[PDB]
C-alpha cells in the first residue's frame, strides 16, 4: 500500500456469510487480499515458456465468528469468517485453493 | 507501486537496431473465502477462491538474433488467463 497501480494489499470488504442448514444469509465486515502483482515472460527455450507466475493470496489470517440466527434446531449457528491480516504474492495452493479467473458469483447473499 | 504489464527491452538478446522486447509487468488479483454456493459444486471442497490474471504476450513475431539461435519477440501485452500459478 503505496499508489494507483497498487501492490498486494489487504482490502476491506463485505462478505456474505451463510451456513448449510439455515435460510438466513447475512453479511459481514471483513478483509480480503487484493491488488496488482508481478508476473512476466520468457524469450528463449521456445517450446513453451515455463517460468512461474505469482498471484496474490492470504499470508496471515485470523478468524472471527458471527452467529447466524433463524436456523433450525440442530444446525450450528456460529459461523466463522477469516480476516486477512497479511496479504502476499506467492503461488496457488492446489489443496486449499481454487485458482482461475474472475469467478462464478461475486461476494453477497442473493 | 508495481509496473504495468507492458513491453520492455531485453538487453541480452536486444542489440541496437535490433531491440528485443519482452512482456512483463503487473496484473490484478483476488483471493477470498469460497462462497458456500460454489463450495457445493466442488468435488474437492477447497476453501479460498482465487481470481488471477497474469502478464502474457498476445502477439509475438519470431526473429533470429546474433548468435544463430532464434528468440520470441513480443509485439503486445495483455493481462490474460494465468497458466503457471498453480502449485
Amino acid at each position, epitope marked *: 500500500k503505496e499508489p494507483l497501480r497498487p501492490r498486494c494489499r489487504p482490502i476491506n470488504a463485505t462478505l456474505a456469510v451463510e451456513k448449510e442448514g439455515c435460510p438466513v444469509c447475512i453479511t459481514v465486515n471483513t478483509t480480503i487480499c487484493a491488488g496488482y502483482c508481478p508476473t512476466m515472460t520468457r524469450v528463449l527455450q521456445g517450446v513453451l515458456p515455463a517460468l512461474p507466475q505469482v498471484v496474490c493470496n492470504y499470508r496471515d489470517v485470523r478468524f472471527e465468528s458471527i452467529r447466524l440466527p433463524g436456523c433450525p434446531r*440442530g*444446525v450450528n449457528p456460529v459461523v466463522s469468517y477469516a480476516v486477512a491480516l497479511s496479504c502476499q504474492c506467492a503461488l496457488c495452493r492446489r489443496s486449499t485453493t481454487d485458482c482461475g479467473g474472475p469467478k462464478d458469483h461475486p461476494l453477497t447473499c442473493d | 507501486d508495481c509496473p504495468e504489464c507492458t513491453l520492455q527491452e531485453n538487453p541480452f538478446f536486444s542489440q541496437p537496431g535490433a531491440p528485443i522486447l519482452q512482456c512483463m509487468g503487473c496484473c490484478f488479483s483476488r483471493a477470498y473465502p469460497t462462497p458456500l454456493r460454489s463450495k457445493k459444486t466442488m468435488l474437492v471442497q477447497k476453501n479460498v477462491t482465487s481470481e488471477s490474471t497474469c502478464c502474457v504476450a498476445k502477439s509475438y513475431n519470431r526473429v533470429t538474433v546474433m548468435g544463430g539461435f532464434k528468440v520470441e519477440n513480443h509485439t503486445a501485452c495483455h493481462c490474460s488467463t494465468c497458466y503457471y500459478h498453480k502449485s
Partner: antibody, heavy 120, light 107 residues
Framework: QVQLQESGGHLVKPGGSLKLSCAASGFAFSSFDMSWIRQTPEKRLEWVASITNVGTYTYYPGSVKGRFSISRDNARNTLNLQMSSLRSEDTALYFC???????????????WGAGTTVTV | DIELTQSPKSMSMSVGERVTLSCKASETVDSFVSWYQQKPEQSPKLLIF???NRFSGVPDRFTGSGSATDFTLTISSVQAEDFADYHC?????????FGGGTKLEIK
C-alpha cells in the same frame, strides 16, 4: 443410572433391511437431540443420524440418505433407525449417543451407547 | 464435508513421557472440536469438548487447545490407563465428522 443401550443386530443380506432400537433411561430423553454413530471395522467413527427432540427436523449424512430413517418415542424413551438398502459398507458397530447441551445440541457428543454389531 | 486429519495414526510410548496429538480441519472449525478416548472394547469416553474445555471427571493431565483449523490434545505424564485410541470430531457443520484417530501404545 443414565442407561442408554441398543438392541437389534444380526447378519443381514445385501439388499436387506434392519431396524436398530436404542432404549434410554435416567435422563430427560425428550429434551436432548439423539444421534446414531457407527464405528467401521477399520476402527474409525462415522456419524449417521440426528433426530431433534419431538423432532421432526431430521439431519442425515449424504452417504446414508434414502436408506436410513431415524425415529423417536419420547413416551417409551427409545430411539430407532430403520436401515434399508444396506450394502457391505454398512457392516459396523452401532452406538446411539446423545448431544451438546439441551439448549445448544451442537456441542459435545455424550453418553454413547454400548453398540450393536451389524454384519453383512 | 470438512475432513479432520489426525496424526500420528499410531504412537509407541513409555509411561511418564509427554505426548501431544494433532487433529487438523480442512476448513475453519472454530472451537467445535472434541476429543474422545476409546479403550479396547468400549464406548468412547468424551474427555474434552470445545477446543480447550475439559469434560467433568477428566484428570488434570489431559489438556486441550486450538483455534480455527489446528487442534491438539496433550497428555502430560501418561500412565498405564490412557493406552487407548483417540479421536476428534467437529460439530460445526453437517455432516458431523470425526477423525482417523491416534493410537497410544506402551513399551
Amino acid at each position: 443410572q443414565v442407561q442408554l443401550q441398543e438392541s437389534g443386530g444380526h447378519l443381514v443380506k445385501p439388499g436387506g433391511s434392519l431396524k436398530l432400537s436404542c432404549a434410554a433411561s435416567g435422563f430427560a430423553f425428550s429434551s436432548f437431540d439423539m444421534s446414531w454413530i457407527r464405528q467401521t471395522p477399520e476402527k474409525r467413527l462415522e456419524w449417521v443420524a440426528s433426530i431433534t427432540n419431538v423432532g421432526t427436523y431430521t439431519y442425515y449424512p449424504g452417504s446414508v440418505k434414502g436408506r436410513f430413517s431415524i425415529s423417536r418415542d419420547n413416551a417409551r424413551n427409545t430411539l430407532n433407525l430403520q436401515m434399508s438398502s444396506l450394502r457391505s459398507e454398512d457392516t459396523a458397530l452401532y452406538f446411539c449417543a446423545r448431544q451438546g447441551t439441551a439448549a445448544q445440541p451442537y456441542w459435545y457428543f455424550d453418553v454413547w451407547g454400548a453398540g450393536t454389531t451389524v454384519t453383512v | 464435508d470438512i475432513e479432520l486429519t489426525q496424526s500420528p495414526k499410531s504412537m509407541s510410548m513409555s509411561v511418564g513421557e509427554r505426548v501431544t496429538l494433532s487433529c487438523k480441519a480442512s476448513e475453519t472449525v472454530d472451537s467445535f472440536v472434541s476429543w474422545y478416548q476409546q479403550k479396547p472394547e468400549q464406548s468412547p469416553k468424551l474427555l474434552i469438548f470445545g477446543a480447550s474445555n475439559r469434560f467433568s471427571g477428566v484428570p488434570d493431565r489431559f489438556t486441550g487447545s486450538g483455534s480455527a483449523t489446528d487442534f491438539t490434545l496433550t497428555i502430560s505424564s501418561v500412565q498405564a490407563e490412557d493406552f487407548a485410541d483417540y479421536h476428534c470430531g467437529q460439530t460445526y457443520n453437517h455432516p458431523y465428522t470425526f477423525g482417523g484417530g491416534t493410537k497410544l501404545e506402551i513399551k
